[PDB]
Ligand binder design. Structure first.
Ligand code: CL
Ligand code: CL
Length: 263
């Protein structure tokens, strides 16, 4: 279920990462390698991860995209996708994001979890995930597809590490007992104006299901979710463009707010 040569995987990884590192958008890689499979795309993504680790980056978490059944159906995919988060992606709550290091960023409001017990697939589901959750933490992702392309292409997006680039944790942490994730309301404000609303249920119907799907996805490559893993479970809100000068604040029901300043 792979069509790329290893040489092509390595080259695509270098090419795609270079788009991020040099803040230069590129054509979607499936235009040049149309046979690419998801396995190919993850090969590329994990090779990007290796390149980052090899230069000393710590990988500090994972993120989930396509966490909408409607969107999945639209894309003709049966599962979400994931990407990894590098240490330098992290931005503190209220902190600065330098848009000059980004291409055409957008933000999505999410709820993240930190696990306290290992999880694995295949066949992982919500019930398995519950006992493994340490706490939840409001998180805003800055996503920034390295592609010039207007239309979403899941395989190219996976290869591009699911468009990951920054994440801002903030608000207040909470145990599962303290929060109802499905009805957890989120209000995204940009420059003082409410721009998106949504609830945690927008992630698959239940944000913790994302963790289970992640575990099953990882199991496809013989990996799992170690205890202590930070996972951004998926965009609750539609993604919102951000540009220099923008200030955002995302309020989470009972969990305070996450803010960032874009310069
Ligand atoms: Cl930055
Ligand atoms: Cl296009």
């Amino acid at each position: 279920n792979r069509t790329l040569t290893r040489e092509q995987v390595l080259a695509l990884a270098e090419h795609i990462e270079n788009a991020e590192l040099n803040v230069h958008d590129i054509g979607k890689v499936t235009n040049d390698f149309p046979e690419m499979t998801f396995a190919d795309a993850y090969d590329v993504q994990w090779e990007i991860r290796r390149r980052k680790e090899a230069r000393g980056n710590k990988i500090v978490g994972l993120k989930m995209g396509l966490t909408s059944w409607a969107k999945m159906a639209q894309m003709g995919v049966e599962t979400p996708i994931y990407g990894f988060l590098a240490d330098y992606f992290s931005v503190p709550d209220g902190g600065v994001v330098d848009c000059s290091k980004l291409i055409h960023p957008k933000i999505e409001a999410e709820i993240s979890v930190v696990t306290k017990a290992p999880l694995h697939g295949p066949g992982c589901h919500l019930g398995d995930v519950i006992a493994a959750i340490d706490y939840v933490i409001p998180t805003v992702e800055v996503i920034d597809s390295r592609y010039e392309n207007f239309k979403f292409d899941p395989i190219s997006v996976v290869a591009d590490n699911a468009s990951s680039t920054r994440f801002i944790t903030g608000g207040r942490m909470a145990s599962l007992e303290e929060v109802d994730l499905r009805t957890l309301g989120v209000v995204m404000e940009k420059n003082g104006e409410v721009v998106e609303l949504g609830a945690g249920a927008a992630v698959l119907g239940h944000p913790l299901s994302s963790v289970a799907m992640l575990a099953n996805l990882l199991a496809e490559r013989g990996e799992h979710i170690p205890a202590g893993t930070f996972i951004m479970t998926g965009g609750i809100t539609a993604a919102v463009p951000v540009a220099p000068g923008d200030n955002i604040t995302v309020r989470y029901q009972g969990l305070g707010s996450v803010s960032a300043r874009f310069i």
